[PDB]
């Protein structure tokens, strides 16, 4: 029975509308998990969802417990920095080390969406990469925000709408910068759903492929977005180098290690 008391504080991940999450170290062991803390006062289809299902690439939950005024979720943490960091110290990843993210990405969608579970929040912000350089999908920010048009025009947030924030994250991957990057800000409600998203001349005809896709502001044209769902996504032209079953069984090889001993390495807990 965890509690309060097991966990030692070591620092702030997140605060928010609806909590925080705090980076906390289990005392008995020594692990280490992120806890996500609950106004009771404040607040279904996060907890208990997310409890039961695991995945390679899902952020795990490890303990959940409440206290008399708040809901606390003990989850796993991984330790190999933030995709947005290692992005950032890179301006851009290479066609094929983003593909790698992609499809560790694509194979968490498919599970999810298999369960009949919208995770509405595949973006740069909710990825992380552990010890050995495995993608994390982590559920919370540690930003303009890139929402799907048909969240944007119909508060409409279904399978493809996980499509959309694929093609974004991969897309600001590939090309190091978000679609609409420079123009404004308050624009982007008009463009996002107005606006022709454009391609550097530098891109694989085939990744200018994918991303023309991910992104197509009709949900019901997007790709990803047919009956077959993540197949479309994985039997697309960028993605034929893959073995979805590699994938799932973290048998691929991350394109870049990390540089953590142990998991309990908190070399990337700061800056």
């Known amino acids: 029975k965890v509690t309060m008391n097991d966990f030692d504080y070591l620092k702030l991940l997140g605060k928010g509308t609806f909590?925080?999450?705090?980076?906390?170290?289990?005392?008995?062991?020594?692990?280490?998990?992120?806890?996500?803390?609950?106004?009771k006062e404040v607040?279904?289809?996060?907890?208990?969802?997310?409890?039961?299902?695991?995945?390679?690439?899902?952020?795990?939950?490890?303990?959940?417990?409440?206290?008399?005024?708040?809901?606390?979720?003990?989850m796993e943490y991984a330790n190999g920095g933030e995709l947005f960091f290692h992005l950032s110290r890179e301006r851009v990843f290479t066609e094929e080390r983003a593909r790698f993210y992609g499809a560790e990405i694509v194979s968490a969608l498919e599970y999810l969406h298999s369960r009949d579970v919208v995770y509405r929040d595949i973006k740069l912000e909710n990825l992380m990469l552990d010890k050995d350089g495995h993608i994390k999908i982590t559920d919370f920010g540690l930003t303009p925000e890139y929402l799907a048009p048909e969240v944007l025009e119909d508060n409409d947030y279904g399978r493809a709408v996980d499509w959309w924030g694929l093609g974004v994250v991969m897309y600001e991957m590939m090309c190091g910068r978000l679609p609409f990057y420079?123009?404004?800000?308050?624009?982007?409600?008009?463009?996002?759903?107005?606006?022709?998203?454009?391609?550097?001349?530098?891109?694989?005809?085939?990744?200018?492929?994918?991303?023309?896709?991910?992104?197509?502001?009709?949900?019901?044209?997007?790709?990803?977005?047919?009956?077959?769902?993540?197949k479309e996504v994985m039997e697309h032209r960028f993605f034929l180098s893959i073995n979805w079953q590699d994938v799932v069984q973290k048998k691929l090889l991350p394109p870049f290690k990390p540089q953590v001993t142990s998991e309990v390495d908190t070399r990337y807990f700061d800056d």
Not at 62 to 73: E, G, I, N, S, W
Not at 199 to 217: C, D, H, M, N
């Open 182 to 230: 420079n123009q404004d800000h308050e624009r982007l409600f008009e463009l996002i759903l107005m606006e022709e998203i454009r391609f550097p001349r530098t891109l694989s005809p085939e990744a200018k492929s994918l991303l023309a896709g991910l992104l197509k502001k009709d949900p019901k044209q997007r790709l990803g977005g047919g009956p077959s769902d993540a």
């Open 19 to 39: 909590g925080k999450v705090i980076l906390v170290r289990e005392k008995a062991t020594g692990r280490y998990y992120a806890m996500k803390i609950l106004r």
């Open 43 to 74: 607040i279904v289809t996060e907890s208990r969802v997310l409890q039961n299902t695991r995945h390679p690439f899902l952020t795990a939950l490890k303990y959940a417990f409440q206290t008399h005024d708040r809901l606390c979720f003990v």
